[PDB]
Design a protein around this ligand. Structure first.
Ligand SMILES: [Cl-]
Ligand SMILES: [Cl-]
Ligand SMILES: [Cl-]
Ligand SMILES: [Cl-]
Ligand code: NA
Length: 129
């Protein structure tokens, strides 16, 4: 599913991301826009042989099992395919784990490079929340 911006904002809000670890909902919508272009189906292979999955481009090195990243972890206890569903529950739950892991939203390269320190409330402008 390719979410709309406010559609995704609503879904992320209902699933508990707004202010989660102190990151306002705009940070999450911004990260999703630049990670996946709001596309739950997005996959992107990494040099190390892991892959990033879903709206928030969660990596198989640590977080989900894809069956082809040897010596990786599955800290979210999910198949990576779970992160590709139109239903973002798995992605959000896994994102909560990631952002709790010491490194905050710096875990997402697109958030660090395109959202951190910017006016992220813009991403939830106009939405009925
Ligand atoms: Cl915000
Ligand atoms: Cl699995
Ligand atoms: Cl959803
Ligand atoms: Cl933090
Ligand atoms: Na893994």
């Amino acid at each position: 599913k390719v979410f709309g911006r406010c559609e995704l904002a609503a879904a992320m809000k209902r699933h508990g991301l707004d202010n989660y670890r102190g990151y306002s909902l705009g940070n999450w919508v911004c990260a999703a826009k630049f990670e996946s272009n709001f596309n739950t189906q997005a996959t992107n292979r990494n040099t190390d042989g892991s892959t990033d999955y879903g709206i928030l481009q969660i990596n198989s090195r640590w977080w989900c099992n894809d069956g082809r990243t040897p010596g990786s972890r599955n800290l979210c206890n999910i198949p990576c395919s779970a992160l590709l569903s139109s239903d973002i529950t798995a992605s959000v739950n896994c994102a909560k784990k990631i952002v709790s892991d010491g490194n905050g939203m710096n875990a997402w390269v697109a958030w660090r490079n395109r959202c951190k320190g910017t006016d992220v409330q813009a991403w939830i402008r106009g939405c009925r929340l």
